[PDB]
Structures are given as C-alpha cells and as structure tokens.
Write an enzyme that holds these catalytic residues in place. Structure first.
Site, PDB file in Angstrom:
ATOM      1  N   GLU A  90      76.545 -24.472  28.634  1.00 38.62           N
ATOM      2  CA  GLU A  90      75.182 -24.918  28.969  1.00 38.62           C
ATOM      3  C   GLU A  90      74.921 -24.977  30.470  1.00 38.62           C
ATOM      4  O   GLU A  90      73.765 -24.856  30.889  1.00 38.62           O
ATOM      5  CB  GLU A  90      74.889 -26.273  28.326  1.00 38.62           C
ATOM      6  CG  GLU A  90      74.875 -26.283  26.818  1.00 38.62           C
ATOM      7  CD  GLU A  90      73.693 -25.517  26.213  1.00 38.62           C
ATOM      8  OE1 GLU A  90      72.748 -25.158  26.969  1.00 38.62           O
ATOM      9  OE2 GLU A  90      73.682 -25.309  24.970  1.00 38.62           O
ATOM     10  N   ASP A 133      65.078 -22.478  29.001  1.00 32.74           N
ATOM     11  CA  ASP A 133      66.294 -22.070  28.310  1.00 32.74           C
ATOM     12  C   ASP A 133      66.211 -20.584  27.896  1.00 32.74           C
ATOM     13  O   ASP A 133      65.283 -19.875  28.299  1.00 32.74           O
ATOM     14  CB  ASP A 133      66.607 -22.997  27.137  1.00 32.74           C
ATOM     15  CG  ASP A 133      65.677 -22.842  25.950  1.00 32.74           C
ATOM     16  OD1 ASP A 133      64.815 -21.948  25.922  1.00 32.74           O
ATOM     17  OD2 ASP A 133      65.868 -23.633  24.987  1.00 32.74           O
TER      18      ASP A 133
HETATM   19 CL   LIG Z   1      70.622 -28.523  23.208  1.00 32.90          CL
END
Ligand SMILES: [Cl-]
Ligand SMILES: [Cl-]
Ligand SMILES: [Cl-]
Length: 162
Positions: free
Chosen positions: A11, A20
C-alpha cells in the site's frame, strides 16, 4: 514479516490525499476515503476519520492509526462472514495474512465472491487455487500485488515479500 508489514509494502504511505489504483480518493496506507469524485467529500471523510480539520494532510502517526483500524476491520470482517470465516480458520497464519490482504484491498463482499478460489484454498489445493485466483479482474488490474498475494497462498511462506 507480518500482515501489517505486508500491507505497508503493498500500500505504501502517503500523507496527502491521493487517488488509488481505481481512481478513488485515499490517504495514508491505502485508507479509502470515498468513491465520490468530489475532493471536498473526501476531505470531509478525512476530517471525520481523524477528528480534526486536516486540510487534506495528515501525520504518519495518524496514518498508522487509521491503518491499525483498517487491518482490525478486515479481520473482524472475515470472522463475521459465513463464506470467509471457514476458509480463514482452515488456513495457517501466513496464508491467513494473504486473505486479510485481499479483504483490505477489495472488501469483504468482493473476496467472499471468489467462491471457487475459496473452496480450493479450504481443500489445500494450493497450485490449483493459485491458478484460479489469477483468473480475476483483481489479478489483471493489479498483477504485481496479486502475484505476491497468490505466491503467499501457494507457498505459505513470505518469499514474495523478501
Ligand atoms: Cl484499503
Ligand atoms: Cl481454475
Ligand atoms: Cl499491482
């Protein structure tokens, strides 16, 4: 290695609002804020999450706080789900982390739909599960991450995160 370090690798850490891989406003260690295209809506979610007027920027400690909550939520999500709990309970600790990682990324509902993959994992048909998991939008859209998670399911080791 552990589920926290694993997800930190997958991440990253960003202290300002970013989009994202799906184009959704996110902050910290993959903390999704909203699917709304409104940056103001994302900023509102962020302030509500942190408990202050952040102006779209947070600290590392704050990012880690949300991350801890998010990991907790993914695990509790698995345990509450009739489809995921049996599979989770059948797995060893390393493979459990791979399942948590999927739920963190996609959500409880999205993972619980991998019905055929979940069955193969419960059967401990590791190579077959790995093949089946890759026949997915998930794999095609985030292949390098999916390859790491799948390797973890296939091997029950952390080799893909070394
Ligand atoms: Cl997430
Ligand atoms: Cl298959
Ligand atoms: Cl990827």
């Amino acid at each position: 290695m552990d589920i926290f370090e694993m997800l930190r690798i997958d991440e990253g850490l960003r202290l300002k609002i970013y989009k994202d891989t799906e184009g959704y406003y996110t902050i910290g260690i993959g903390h999704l804020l909203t699917k709304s295209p409104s940056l103001n809506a994302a900023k509102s979610e962020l302030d509500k999450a942190i408990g202050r007027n952040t102006n779209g920027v947070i600290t590392k400690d704050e990012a880690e706080k949300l991350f801890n909550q998010d990991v907790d939520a993914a695990v509790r999500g698995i345990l509450r789900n009739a489809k995921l709990k049996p599979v989770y309970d059948s797995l060893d600790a390393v493979r459990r982390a791979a399942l948590i990682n999927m739920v963190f990324q996609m959500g409880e509902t999205g993972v619980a739909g991998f019905t055929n993959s979940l069955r193969m994992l419960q059967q401990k048909r590791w190579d077959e599960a790995a093949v089946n998991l890759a026949k997915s939008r998930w794999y095609n859209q985030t292949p390098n991450r999916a390859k790491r998670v799948i390797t973890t399911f296939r091997t029950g080791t952390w080799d893909a995160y070394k």
